[PDB]
Design a protein around this nucleic acid. Sequence first.
DNA 1: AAGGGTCCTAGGACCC
DNA 2: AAGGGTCCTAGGACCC
Lengths: 367, 367
Amino acid sequence: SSRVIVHVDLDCFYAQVEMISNPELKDKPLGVQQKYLVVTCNYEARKLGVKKLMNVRDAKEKCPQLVLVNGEDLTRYREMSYKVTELLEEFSPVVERLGFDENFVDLTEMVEKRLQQLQSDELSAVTVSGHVYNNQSINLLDVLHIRLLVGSQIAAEMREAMYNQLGLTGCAGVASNKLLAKLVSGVFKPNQQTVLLPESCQHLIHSLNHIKEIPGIGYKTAKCLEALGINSVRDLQTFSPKILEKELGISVAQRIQKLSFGEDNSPVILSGPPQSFSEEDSFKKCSSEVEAKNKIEELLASLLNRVCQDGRKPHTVRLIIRRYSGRESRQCPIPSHVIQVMTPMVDILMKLFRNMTLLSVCFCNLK
Amino acid sequence: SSRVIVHVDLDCFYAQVEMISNPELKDKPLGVQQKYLVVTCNYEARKLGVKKLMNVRDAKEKCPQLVLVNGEDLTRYREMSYKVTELLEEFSPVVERLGFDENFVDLTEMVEKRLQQLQSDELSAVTVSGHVYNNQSINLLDVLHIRLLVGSQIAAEMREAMYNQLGLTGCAGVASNKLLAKLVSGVFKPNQQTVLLPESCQHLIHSLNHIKEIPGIGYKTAKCLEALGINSVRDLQTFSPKILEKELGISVAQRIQKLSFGEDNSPVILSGPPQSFSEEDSFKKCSSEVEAKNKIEELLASLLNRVCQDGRKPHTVRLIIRRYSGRESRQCPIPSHVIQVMTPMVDILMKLFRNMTLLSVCFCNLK
DNA sequence: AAGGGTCCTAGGACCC
DNA sequence: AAGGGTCCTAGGACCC
Ligand SMILES: Cc1cn([C@H]2C[C@H](O)[C@@H](COP(=O)(O)OP(=O)(O)OP(=O)(O)O)O2)c(=O)[nH]c1=O
Ligand SMILES: Cc1cn([C@H]2C[C@H](O)[C@@H](COP(=O)(O)OP(=O)(O)OP(=O)(O)O)O2)c(=O)[nH]c1=O
Ligand SMILES: [Ca+2]
Ligand SMILES: [Ca+2]
Ligand SMILES: [Ca+2]
Ligand SMILES: [Ca+2]
């Protein structure tokens, strides 16, 4: 029943990538820019008040020296993300990706294998690597403590390999399920790691100050919960199961109430190859003219290049748009003879276009 | 490029099943009844005017002696259907099911293997089994003719095994793709088979009298086509690709126009185990009372029994309803602890019920 | 008042 | 005027 899960979360991911390619940007407050948004920044820039997802206007207002590099093309970040996932896959094959810079690994089989190689002597010598959440005391006679400490040791090897082999720093969190691993990985956050022993699980979930900090409780779910007088984790822990069910759904309810107790039986999923390939362009209604075709052609070339280099081929294409004021989309299957190119593909999309501040294309249904 | 496909289609399937279990019902006009609908009938009953999908009222008006057996529980038909598919799977593993009584098999690899065992002597001795569509003359020096005749020979073995091993008769159609195999299988229809040589493909598609007879052109697509002045297969063959595209979709258009030429590159799919498990009950608004729970409990017991006997377990449940006057449905994931029962499951469904002439339950998302 | 199936679509909620 | 992802849902079109 008892699992040992690790959650890995890279430091200022995009900024770290740019800092690696241009070693200079180190020691200097660095922001990575996407249109008007400083999507992230390195930790220098955070000392000087810059925050993640901050308008470029406010970002300089706080840091007029902030160096900005453009991060609208994700290619280099996407490439590093998969190098990280591939490296962790060497440790244990079942690695679940979450976004570009997080990975879960179920270390359970691994922890168990390392224990069978030890004796009663080695067992009393087992030590933690990194922080223990809430400064909790360890009990070496507690098998669960021993296994989570072995997890912490695997997590440090992972982070060390990530640095030695890819030049990347990040955090790790080790716990008994994915929810808790992800919540504990951020407790000590610049390039460090934390392990959560079970006795401190309630301290961890009650350290949160609003329910949206629970992975799985988003903007909409949070809004509906405060509208019911639910604000703290304990409020959600103690709320009526029935009212919850019959307010936002038996699905949402029974799951986010379980989460509110630190419970989560979800398995670590093997993410494997991507399920989709998309690109976007945003603009200040900078498209009013069906010559919008050009934007779509540009998105095409990139996507076709990424697909070709993947190796599989998609069987569905989708076009997404946003109208000034809530996105809309039209998809259609891809014809057989095309699947084995620009000219046919753009004609497809323009008809999907004409059937209907942002333009996007998605290739999915990959085989 | 060139395939040899077989399409198998059982005679008066439900009626045949009932006739087997109760050998008496043979020689007697037999109708299988579902509420007010004689869903099918044996061929005796068809001589006397009974037709498939005919009200029981009209069915006796034509045949006041018509014996009727109730076919609302599909269990025995479902069981035979899979015995048929399993038998054809012995011939070639990739068998595609369509409904309960049709199967496609790609005989291409099989045909080719049998040819390599023959010599120029055996090649001039190759004969057809069954009918040749349109009485077309065979050219033994035509490799395509030879391969489709070998297909016709495999199709006769299949039908013979189906009879010797399962007591079931049906038709087969052999052609170069699934569309044409399915259209030619019905040309000689009580327990016979037909092979389509390529020179007669246009004769086959133009033998149809309305476009809805094309598999893939349904009620809605047909209605929209007649509304555009499209009525014959040739009308659809010759219609504007552009207008078609921009009237019902690049998907629907480019595909049903291809079909209208007898073209179809769709592969034979391995259907394998079912993707869902559902049951239904219909009634003359015989449910106005949330004691509708009982109907749902009854559907449950059966579905739980079928699932348990399958071996896999579902991860989604769905409830469907129809209101007097266009169906509606609510689904939700299945909780982990239940998946490994009646009481929890019915409570799930009643809340899905209350969130909302027919009641149905579906188990899908099987793992 | 059939009684089943397969697969696609537009959208939505969540994650980073 | 971010720029990406994963997965679910209610419905719809088709097949028998
Ligand atoms: C949340 C989020 C992340 N990202 C990108 C940029 C981030 O570098 C990357 C990972 O996001 P985060 O891990 O959430 O932030 P971070 O890695 O940049 O900084 P931290 O050290 O606190 O973890 O994903 C977006 O582009 N948009 C978003 O809304
Ligand atoms: C088309 C159809 C079939 N069925 C069932 C009953 C049929 O026995 C079975 C197969 O249908 P069909 O093969 O279309 O008809 P049939 O097999 O009964 O008669 P035939 O010899 O002409 O092929 O599926 C329905 O219940 N409802 C329907 O709408
Ligand atoms: Ca992160
Ligand atoms: Ca991060
Ligand atoms: Ca049939
Ligand atoms: Ca039939």
